[PDB]
Amino acid sequence: QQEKEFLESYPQNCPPDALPGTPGNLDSAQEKALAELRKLLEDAGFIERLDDSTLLRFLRARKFDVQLAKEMFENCEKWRKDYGTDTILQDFHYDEKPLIAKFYPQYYHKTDKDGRPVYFEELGAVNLHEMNKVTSEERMLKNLVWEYESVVQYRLPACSRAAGHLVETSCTIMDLKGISISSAYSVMSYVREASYISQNYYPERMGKFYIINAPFGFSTAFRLFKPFLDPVTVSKIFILGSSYQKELLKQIPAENLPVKFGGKSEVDESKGGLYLSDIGPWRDPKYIGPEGEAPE
Amino acid sequence: QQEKEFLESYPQNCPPDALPGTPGNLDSAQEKALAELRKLLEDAGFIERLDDSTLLRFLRARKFDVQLAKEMFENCEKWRKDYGTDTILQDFHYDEKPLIAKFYPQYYHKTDKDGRPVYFEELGAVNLHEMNKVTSEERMLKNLVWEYESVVQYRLPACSRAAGHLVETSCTIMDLKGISISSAYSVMSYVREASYISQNYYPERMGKFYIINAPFGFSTAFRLFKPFLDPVTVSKIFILGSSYQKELLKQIPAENLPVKFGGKSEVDESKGGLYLSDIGPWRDPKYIGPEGEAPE
Ligand SMILES: CCCCCCCCO[C@@H]1O[C@H](CO)[C@@H](O)[C@H](O)[C@H]1O
Numbered sequence: 001q002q003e004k005e006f007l008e009s010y011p012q013n014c015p016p017d018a019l020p021g022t023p024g025n026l027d028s029a030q031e032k033a034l035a036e037l038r039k040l041l042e043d044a045g046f047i048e049r050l051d052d053s054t055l056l057r058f059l060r061a062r063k064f065d066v067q068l069a070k071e072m073f074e075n076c077e078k079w080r081k082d083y084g085t086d087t088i089l090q091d092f093h094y095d096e097k098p099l100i101a102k103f104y105p106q107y108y109h110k111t112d113k114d115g116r117p118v119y120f121e122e123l124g125a126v127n128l129h130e131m132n133k134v135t136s137e138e139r140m141l142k143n144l145v146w147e148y149e150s151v152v153q154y155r156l157p158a159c160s161r162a163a164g165h166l167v168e169t170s171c172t173i174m175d176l177k178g179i180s181i182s183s184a185y186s187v188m189s190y191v192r193e194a195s196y197i198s199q200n201y202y203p204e205r206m207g208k209f210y211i212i213n214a215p216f217g218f219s220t221a222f223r224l225f226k227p228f229l230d231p232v233t234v235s236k237i238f239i240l241g242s243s244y245q246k247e248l249l250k251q252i253p254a255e256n257l258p259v260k261f262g263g264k265s266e267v268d269e270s271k272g273g274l275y276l277s278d279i280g281p282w283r284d285p286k287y288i289g290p291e292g293e294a295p296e
Numbered sequence: 297q298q299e300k301e302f303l304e305s306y307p308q309n310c311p312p313d314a315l316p317g318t319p320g321n322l323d324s325a326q327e328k329a330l331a332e333l334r335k336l337l338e339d340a341g342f343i344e345r346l347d348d349s350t351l352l353r354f355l356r357a358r359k360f361d362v363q364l365a366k367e368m369f370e371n372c373e374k375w376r377k378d379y380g381t382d383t384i385l386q387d388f389h390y391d392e393k394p395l396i397a398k399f400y401p402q403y404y405h406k407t408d409k410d411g412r413p414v415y416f417e418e419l420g421a422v423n424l425h426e427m428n429k430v431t432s433e434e435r436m437l438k439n440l441v442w443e444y445e446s447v448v449q450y451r452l453p454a455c456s457r458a459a460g461h462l463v464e465t466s467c468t469i470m471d472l473k474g475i476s477i478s479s480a481y482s483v484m485s486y487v488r489e490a491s492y493i494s495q496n497y498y499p500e501r502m503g504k505f506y507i508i509n510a511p512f513g514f515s516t517a518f519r520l521f522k523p524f525l526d527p528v529t530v531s532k533i534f535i536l537g538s539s540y541q542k543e544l545l546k547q548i549p550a551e552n553l554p555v556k557f558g559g560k561s562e563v564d565e566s567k568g569g570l571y572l573s574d575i576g577p578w579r580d581p582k583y584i585g586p587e588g589e590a591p592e
Pocket residue numbers: 123172174176191194195196197198199200205206207209
């Protein structure tokens with residue numbers, strides 16, 4: 001009575017108007033696709049992470065090819081064992097965070113109108129040189145997986161309860177204000193590594209993606225490739241310039257969005273404002289289940 | 297005996313390994329799609345431009361929806377009547393060309409390895425201010441349609457004969473060396489207008505598209521959207537930086553590519569080198585048919 005107990009402690013059906021193939025909306029032969037991936041994995045010795053939400057995201061990332069879903073699934077299970085992800089919430093301590101946070105922000109803050117936790121990344125402010133004095137790329141990546149594990153174990157279940165429906169994804173906002181060719185080159189390895197970790201071991205976890213303060217050449221390229229990108233990806237990716245407030249306020253309440261991005265949400269500066277904060281439904285006693293409160 | 301005489305004066309079958317749906321390769325039910333669009337248009341009063349190559353390009357631009365092909369076809373026929381395209385080769389004289397060519401290059405020069413005429417556009421060198429003294433956007437657009445009409449009436453048929461196979465498309469090379477946000481804004485209207493004229497009244501005329509000397513932010517965006525653009529479009533579009541020679545020499549011979557782009561082709565400077573030139577198979581007496589030599 002632990003995983004089963006956890007799964008039924010929060011809503012498990014995505015909203016009715018959600019993309020097909022998502023939990024509670026799968027019907028078009030995909031039910032049979034789901035009820036096949038579970039059989040193969042049960043025989044292969046696997047016991048955990050076989051819930052509807054999990055396998056469905058694996059089936060969704062691989063167009064519902066039950067064969068490729070097993071591959072992607074085993075390969076991810078291989079990775080969690082090697083990397084020690086299963087014990088990352090209690091093994092790893094990013095005690096350098098207060099020291100380096102200002103050079104590469106990274107922080108979660110409340111939710112958007114769909115219940116998704118909002119993740120902010122001020123990539124344009126990054127200062128790797130000043131960061132390499134304290135930490136290392138390896139540790140920053142451990143922090144990335146540590147936060148991903150907080151999202152699934154604590155944040156998502158709490159958000160589901162607060163929104164009345166599932167919520168398997170997050171809403172991310174990346175700020176490019178301040179990027180240069182120089183710093184862009186200095187972060188490529190971390191970005192390429194972080195990209196590998198999520199769309200392979202955390203697929204379908206992205207629900208919406210916003211890039212604000214994107215430079216002209218960059219923003220222009222998107223405006224020309226729009227008609228050639230699949231409609232499924234243009235529904236999630238948003239590339240906007242210096243005028244982004246109206247768009248953001250259209251997805252995130254206003255009382256939920258930080259004042260710096262055109263909203264009303266203010267974090268007390270006498271306890272690490274925004275950068276060192278982690279406030280949202282997951283810190284509200286009435287939305288915390290049998291898994292207890294997430295770490296800090 | 298004029299259009300019929302013209303059509304059989306040059307090869308009419310695309311190479312065997314070409315994209316399906318192209319003349320001489322259409323089979324998969326598309327033959328019936330072709331032999332339907334012609335019937336509807338014959339009843340609608342249309343007499344010209346009903347050859348396999350034409351209608352097939354219209355069917356290809358609209359995924360083979362015979363219904364939308366008729367719409368796109370009539371709408372283009374409407375446009376040629378209004379604009380006076382049918383008589384553009386003899387009505388319009390871009391006598392300002394020698395004066396303004398240096399501010400917005402534009403020139404055709406020989407062919408690539410597939411027989412396609414190569415079109416060069418040094419957009420990054422554009423100087424609209426210096427150009428507005430002499431011409432106007434309206435005239436530049438008339439020149440664009442005048443050149444398009446030389447491509448189909450003279451250039452393509454000559455290239456077909458020289459390559460031994462059809463050739464319905466052109467190979468374009470756009471140079472961004474020298475662009476600014478400023479000049480990018482100063483040319484948006486011409487580019488937006490020119491884009492409207494080709495993919496609506498000259499569809500499937502683009503076979504390959506190369507953008508060289510693309511700025512970093514711009515080039516980067518393409519490298520991230522690559523996996524999301526359809527494989528049909530990534531086969532035609534190439535976005536490269538300052539190192540483009542190897543790629544170009546891989547598509548265009550070397551004796552065909554101008555020295556400035558990393559090749560061996562040199563045009564005599566005592567008669568308008570490149571900018572004011574128009575040399576290729578269409579100026580070779582042995583590749584000119586009953587349509588005679590193209591104008592200058
Ligand atoms: C200039 C900005 C470049 C940003 C490139 C993406 C860097 C990380 O962005 C992440 O990429 C993941 C891919 O694994 C997605 O699944 C996540 O939703 C996204 O937040």
